[PDB]
């Protein structure tokens, strides 16, 4: 069989890629940022506590207006909150109680949900009968749905446990594009600000960069030793951050095609569930399984503070567009705002 | 108050939504959740005569509602969706007594589920389905087919006792769980009653543990 020749060619290509990456590693980010003065200790206090959910909270998503919020819990309810007044605007019953993700449309007219049912449900918020009703039920995945993000009112990207990602149109409800190439369950995805590229992380300890137009992988970032549970994107649009089960986070650049920085400490021995950046991009907030959220300096690897006050696992984490506040959700059936 | 009229109306709407959430939660609280597991030939789909996502079944016997979830359809890695079932009353494991390879990977699944890092305080109702059919089969052929190391006579008693002792001996977390083993007859009419008894017992134990009286 000539499969051995193909394997040898693939190994040679891997060696070439490794050599090319190593050649570009002239120095380290720490050497450049040595002269940077520290951010300073951050003191954040819980401003608003949102009550009403009666089960573990699995996901949340901020609104574009920076005032509305959407949350999902296993009780079987989708809740829209007004953060300022702590008022419930909408409560939505779900057919399947097992939900693990939610999304908010950029225009604020639609919401999305999905989970172990292998369907992505799209609900319409603006209607003439004054009620929220199902607009679509996108089907076509073989495994559980992990994440979903809107591009506009017409298109949506999902990732699922069939080791696949998908781009869907909505007025036809058909699988427009399919992204394959992973070997393990895809757990997260994050849209670039120019909504033309995105990244995904899977249980094969890898992350991949996809172009929405073409539909094929361009770059593959590796270096983790376990599953990647969360992924974010740098505000500029040229780098991203990851979180894995071996209690570390890493920063990967697009142009250099290699990691620049790793955020680990001896006391932290638990995995990361969520990750996000601030408006400027020098603050990296990451939830953990020790009932805590840690804020790292994105350039110098110095824990600038903690966000304690949750009695269970921190599942979902989100930073507002204007950068005013951070929102966390926990398995203890509570959402909190830390400004 | 310093609010306007529309603000007061929004607050009233929020209060109504809160009331509805309270009633729905109190209604959902009056239910018992069970994790139905076993081989495809075990007979889990026919466990209770009272009767692609998660398979769901619901039945009420003697003023108690039970929702059984079958999650064998989910072929992804169990590590990343098994924590969604940590808050369930019990795991109902059905074993096919007759088929031998079937019962073998049934032991594999039993050990895997019992030794999880999440199900460290939950109990198993083990239904030994196909009792008399396998009894006749074991009259025909010994248990050496799979339990080759096992030494015993051709009688059904010794083979069944060995199989039950095995399935209870793969357990390691004997400190905070208790297996309820039931020989399942073809026309068994005590299945729902047995589930009722087990659920009541485990809920009493749960009260005892939270109150610290156990």
């Amino acid at each position: 069989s000539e499969l051995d020749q193909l394997r040898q060619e693939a190994e040679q290509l891997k060696n070439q890629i490794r050599d090319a990456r190593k050649a570009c590693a002239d120095a380290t980010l720490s050497q450049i940022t040595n002269n940077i003065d520290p951010v300073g200790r951050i003191q954040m206090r819980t401003r608003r506590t949102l009550r009403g959910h009666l089960a573990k909270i699995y996901a949340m998503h901020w609104g574009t207006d920076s005032r509305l919020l959407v949350s999902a819990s296993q009780d079987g309810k989708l809740i829209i909150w007004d953060s300022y007044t702590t008022n419930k605007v909408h409560a939505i019953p779900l057919r399947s109680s097992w939900v693990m993700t939610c999304a908010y449309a950029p225009s604020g007219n639609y919401v999305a949900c999905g989970g172990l049912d292998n369907i992505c449900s799209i609900y319409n918020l603006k209607t003439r009968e004054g009620n929220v009703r199902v607009s679509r039920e996108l089907a076509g995945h073989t495994g559980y749905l992990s994440c979903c993000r809107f591009l506009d009112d017409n298109q949506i990207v999902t990732s699922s446990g069939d080791t696949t990602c998908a781009l869907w149109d909505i007025e036809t409800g058909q699988q427009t594009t399919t992204f394959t190439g992973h070997t393990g369950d895809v757990m997260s995805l994050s849209l670039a600000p120019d909504t033309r590229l995105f990244v995904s992380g899977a249980c094969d300890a890898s992350a991949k960069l996809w172009d929405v137009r073409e539909g094929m992988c361009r770059q593959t970032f590796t270096g983790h030793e376990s599953d990647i549970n969360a992924i974010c994107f740098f505000p500029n649009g040229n780098a991203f951050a990851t979180g894995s089960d071996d209690a570390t986070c890493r920063l990967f650049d697009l142009r250099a095609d290699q990691e620049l920085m790793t955020y680990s400490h001896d006391n932290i021995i638990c995995g990361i569930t969520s990750v996000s950046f601030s408006k400027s991009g020098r603050l990296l907030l990451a939830g953990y399984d020790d009932f805590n959220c840690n804020v790292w300096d994105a350039l110098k690897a110095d824990r600038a503070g903690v966000l304690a006050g949750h009695d269970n696992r921190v599942s979902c984490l989100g930073v507002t567009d204007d950068g005013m506040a951070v929102a966390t959700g926990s398995w203890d059936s509570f959402l909190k705002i830390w400004n | 108050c310093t609010l306007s009229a529309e603000d007061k109306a929004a607050v009233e709407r929020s209060k109504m939504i809160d009331r509805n959430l309270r009633e729905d939660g109190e209604k959902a609280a009056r239910e018992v959740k069970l994790l139905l597991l076993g081989a495809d030939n075990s007979g889990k789909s026919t466990i209770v005569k009272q009767m692609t996502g998660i398979v769901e079944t619901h039945f009420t016997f003697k003023d108690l509602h039970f929702k059984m979830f079958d999650v064998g359809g989910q072929r992804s890695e169990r590590k990343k969706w098994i924590h969604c079932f940590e808050d369930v009353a019990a795991i109902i494991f059905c074993v096919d007594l007759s088929d031998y390879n079937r019962m073998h990977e049934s032991m594999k699944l039993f050990d895997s589920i019992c030794n999880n890092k999440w199900f460290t305080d939950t109990s198993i109702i083990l239904f030994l389905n196909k009792k008399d059919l396998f009894e006749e089969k074991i009259k025909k052929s010994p248990l050496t087919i799979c339990y080759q190391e096992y030494a015993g006579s051709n009688t059904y008693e010794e083979a069944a006792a060995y199989i039950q002792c095995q399935f209870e001996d793969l357990n390691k977390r004997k400190d905070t769980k208790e297996i309820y083993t039931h020989f399942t007859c073809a026309t068994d009419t005590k299945n729902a009653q047995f589930i009722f008894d087990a659920v009541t017992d485990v809920i009493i134990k749960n009260n005892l543990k939270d109150c610290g009286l156990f």
Partner: single-chain antibody, 232 residues
Framework: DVQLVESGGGLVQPGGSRKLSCSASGFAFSSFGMHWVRQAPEKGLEWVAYISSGSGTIYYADTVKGRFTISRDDPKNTLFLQMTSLRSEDTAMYYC??????????????WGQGTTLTVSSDIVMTQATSSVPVTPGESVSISCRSSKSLLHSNGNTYLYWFLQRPGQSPQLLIYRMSNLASGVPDRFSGSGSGTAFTLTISRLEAEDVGVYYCMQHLEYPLTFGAGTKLEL
């Protein structure tokens, strides 16, 4: 389609009683508060009554307090106004109007059709102009005023704009002085300064021939303007 149909009016003698009814169809009646609003035979619109969703808060005007009772039957999609001790001042046409309240909702969006009854601390709105001769393609700017500033600490200016075409029920145009309602021509615009407000219409058409009203929603009772009429 949303339809509020009211019936129960007619001719009554002084001192009588009548129970007007209002049937809703095509929307969730349980989530909407309802207002009863009357218009004199030849005059402007006047507020009467309001009942909230869930029947938790009820408001009546001073004039019709003690004699009018507002009720609703959510399981039957019906609203009732029971009137006792009628007088000649009560002759009018009555409308049902729906309202819903959350962050970013449009109240007073859909009005009824009208039922006629012919018997045998308040903010004052100011719409001084009454008749405006107009030509298609021109621009018009209706203005109105207030007694107390309609701006609140939350940052919202509670002013609403309505247009009544000849032989038609009033239609919402603008809510909170700047937001255009759904299904309204884009040529309409609204502006305000907290005490004085203006509605501007570019590219005037035969459609925009009718009476324009401005209303305040800052506090109860809700008060209307006299009405400025644009006619070709």
């Amino acid at each position: 389609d949303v339809q509020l149909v009211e019936s129960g009016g007619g001719l009554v003698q002084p001192g009588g009683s009548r129970k007007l009814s209002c049937s809703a169809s095509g929307f969730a009646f349980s989530s909407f508060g309802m207002h009863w609003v009357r218009q004199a035979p030849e005059k402007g619109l006047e507020w009467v009554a309001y009942i909230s969703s869930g029947s938790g808060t009820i408001y009546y005007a001073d004039t019709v307090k003690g004699r009018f009772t507002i009720s609703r039957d959510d399981p039957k999609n019906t609203l009732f106004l029971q009137m006792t001790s009628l007088r000649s001042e009560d002759t009018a046409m009555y409308y049902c109007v729906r309202s819903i309240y959350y962050y970013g909702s449009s109240p007073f969006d859909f009005w009824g059709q009208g039922t006629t009854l012919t018997v045998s601390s308040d903010i004052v709105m100011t719409q001084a102009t009454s008749s405006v001769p107009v030509t298609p393609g021109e621009s018009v700017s209706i203005s109105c005023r207030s007694s107390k500033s309609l701006l609140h600490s939350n940052g919202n200016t509670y002013l609403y704009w309505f247009l009544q075409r000849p032989g038609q029920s009033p239609q919402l145009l603008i809510y909170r002085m700047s937001n255009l309602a759904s299904g309204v021509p884009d040529r309409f615009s609204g502006s305000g300064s907290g005490t004085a407000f203006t509605l501007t219409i570019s590219r005037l058409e035969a459609e925009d021939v009718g009476v324009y009203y401005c209303m305040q929603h800052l506090e109860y009772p809700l008060t209307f303007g006299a009405g400025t009429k644009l006619e070709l």
